[PDB]
Amino acid sequence: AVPESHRKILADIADEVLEKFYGCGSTLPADGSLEGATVLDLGCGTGRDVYLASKLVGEHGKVIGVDMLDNQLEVARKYVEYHAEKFFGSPSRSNVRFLKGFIENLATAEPEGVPDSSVDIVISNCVCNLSTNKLALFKEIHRVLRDGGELYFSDVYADRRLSEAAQQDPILYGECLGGALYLEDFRRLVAEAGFRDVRLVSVGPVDVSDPQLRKLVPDVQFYSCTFRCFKVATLEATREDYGQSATYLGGIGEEFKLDRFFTFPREKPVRVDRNTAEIIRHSRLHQWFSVSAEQQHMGLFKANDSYALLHAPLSMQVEQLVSGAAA
Ligand SMILES: C[S@@+](CC[C@H](N)C(=O)[O-])C[C@H]1O[C@@H](n2cnc3c(N)ncnc32)[C@H](O)[C@@H]1O
């Protein structure tokens, strides 16, 4: 969590915003794909990720932050002109806006609601676990994303389904663990919400400090996970080989790392499943890519070193990535 291209921008961010930020990991890609995008942070809080996003999307982009708590947004807003000046040489030239609302129902957020297909990228940091109606939430994300858009986001997940007890406990819930999805239910909910393709970006385990909290969660292993879920009509629930390849064309990195399974060296054509090709093709990523035309259909994609895992269920991709304190 927290790469070095971001670490420079953090430094420039207001003290108050930083001291009052309560985050999971990184909910922002490090690769320069953001220039000019419209970002929306769900449960933005005091505005760390928003202001971070504000630099990355640059002068031509937009960041909208959304939160329910008057007091959190109070802090956030206080630093609009501040950061406008700090990043673009002038106050009153910021690309940052804040709405008051519940993330399950962005159409009624204030001062104005978030219309359909108005957002390139939706991010959130450690927020979604707190929601009492996840399907509604993921459906809301699907609604506001444009086609080609994606949900890039951090949150806390689980090895397994917690007990009835564990799920009712408010200390646990508030500690961000009680509302944490079993990884398999997550895959299922988000597919039901319209996202048939879930890309793992980074994990790392989440310890349980307080032993009295652990009592409710005896054997459960928790994780922190960042996931891309592009909204592209033609995605499928399986990753199919149409013999294609993609070639990253440079202009935003030596490489381009898409998710744990896919990295594209500048001018190396890399073999991709049709799902991947579609994503690259229909999202903003097309600018720094060319994608081969689809051949005949060879069954489930294999042209990848870890192709075995690429087809394994989500909770296995994770566990098998996680075993490894060999740094
Ligand atoms: C984990 S914390 C703060 C993390 C925040 N993303 C940050 O980096 O500062 C929970 C935050 O999400 C907000 N929140 C929780 N549930 C929400 C909901 N249904 N709608 C809007 N905001 C919510 C809380 O107000 C609080 O700002």
Task: Decide: 133 in ligand 1 pocket, CB within 6 A.
Answer: no
From CA 37, how far away is CA 285, in angstroms rounded? Answer: 11
Task: Decide: 72 in ligand 1 pocket, CB within 6 A.
Answer: yes
State phi, psi for 257 to the nearest 5 degrees.
-95, 120
Show the tokens assigned to 88.
């673009």
Helices within the chain (DSSP H only): 4-11, 15-19, 48-56, 70-78, 80-88, 134-144, 164-168, 170-174, 183-192, 211-214, 274-282, 307-311, 314-322
Q: Minimal CA–CA distance to 5: which of 26, 22, 24, 20?
A: 26
Would you state the torsion angle of the CA atoms of residues 156, 157, 161, 164, taken in this order, to the nearest 10 degrees? 10
From CA 154, how far away is CA 152, in angstroms rounded? Answer: 7
Take atom 14 of ligand 1 and give the residue whose Cα is closest: 43
Contact 175, 206 (CB under 8 A): no
Q: How far is CA 325 from the centre of its chain?
A: 24
Q: Which residue has the tokens 């109070």?
A: 74
Residues tagged in the binding site annotation for Ca(2+): 43, 159, 221, 319
According to DSSP, the residues that pair with 265 across neighbouring strands are 255
Show the tokens assigned to 127.
């927020």
Take atom 18 of ligand 1 and give the residue whose Cα is closest: 102
Q: Minimal CA–CA distance to 121: which of 34, 2, 226?
A: 34
From CA 31, how far away is CA 255, in angstroms rounded? Answer: 9
Show the tokens assigned to 322.
């996680």
Max Cα-Cα span within the chain: 57
Q: State the angle between helix axes of 80-88 and 70-78 in degrees (0 to 180), rounded to the nearest 10.
A: 40
From CA 255, how far away is CA 18, in angstroms rounded? Answer: 30
Task: Decide: 140 in ligand 1 pocket, CB within 6 A.
Answer: no
HSE (side-chain half, CA atoms, 13 Å) at 244: 22
According to DSSP, the residues that pair with 98 across neighbouring strands are 65
Helix, strand counts (H, E) of the chain: 13, 13
Question: 296: burial class by Cβ within 10 Å (0-12, 13-18, 19+)?
Answer: exposed
Question: Where do the domains of the chain lie, and which CATH numbers do they carry?
Answer: 1-237 (3.40.50.150), 238-327 (3.40.5.100)
Show the tokens assigned to 236.
């499928």
Nearest atom of ligand 1 to the alpha carbon of 102: 20
Technique of determination? X-ray
Resolution, angstroms, 1 dp: 2.8
According to DSSP, the residues that pair with 72 across neighbouring strands are none
User: Residue 162 contacts by C-beta under 8 Å, 6 or more apart in sequence?
Assistant: 178, 180, 182, 216, 217, 220
CA of residue 22 to ligand 1 center, whole Å: 9
Contact 223, 158 (CB under 8 A): yes
From CA 101, how far away is CA 112, in angstroms rounded? Answer: 10
Among 51, 126, 127, which is best to mutate for testing ligand 1, by the most ligand atoms less than 8 A from CB? Answer: 127
Task: Decide: 74 in ligand 1 pocket, CB within 6 A.
Answer: no
Nearest atom of ligand 1 to the alpha carbon of 69: 25
Residues tagged in the binding site annotation for S-adenosyl-L-methionine: 22, 67, 72, 103-104
Among 102, 124, 130, which is best to mutate for testing ligand 1, by the most ligand atoms less than 8 A from CB? Answer: 130
What is the 8-class DSSP label of residue 285?
A: G
DSSP string for 164-231? HHHHH-HHHHHTTSTTPPBHHHHHHHHHHTT----EEEE--EE---SHHHHTTSTT--EEEEEEEEE-
**Pairing mode, strands 222-230 and 199-202:** antiparallel
Total Cβ atoms within 10 A of residue 46: 26
Task: Decide: 22 in ligand 1 pocket, CB within 6 A.
Answer: yes
HSE (side-chain half, CA atoms, 13 Å) at 26: 18
**Pairing mode, strands 145-158 and 222-230:** antiparallel
Show the tokens assigned to 48.
């760390």
Angle (CA) 10-62-85 rounded to 5° is 55
From CA 129, how far away is CA 42, in angstroms rounded? Answer: 12
Q: Which residue has the tokens 């420039």?
A: 12
What is the 8-class DSSP label of residue 9?
A: H
From CA 183, how far away is CA 180, in angstroms rounded? Answer: 9
CA of residue 143 to ligand 1 center, whole Å: 20
From CA 52, how far away is CA 14, in angstroms rounded? Answer: 11
CA of residue 154 to ligand 1 center, whole Å: 12
HSE (side-chain half, CA atoms, 13 Å) at 74: 5
From CA 273, how far away is CA 69, in angstroms rounded? Answer: 43
According to DSSP, the residues that pair with 291 across neighbouring strands are 246
CA of residue 124 to ligand 1 center, whole Å: 9
Contact 288, 256 (CB under 8 A): yes
Q: Which residue has the tokens 């960041």?
A: 63
Residues tagged in the binding site annotation for S-adenosyl-L-homocysteine: 22, 67, 103-104
DSSP string for 113-129? ---TT-EEEEEEBS-GG
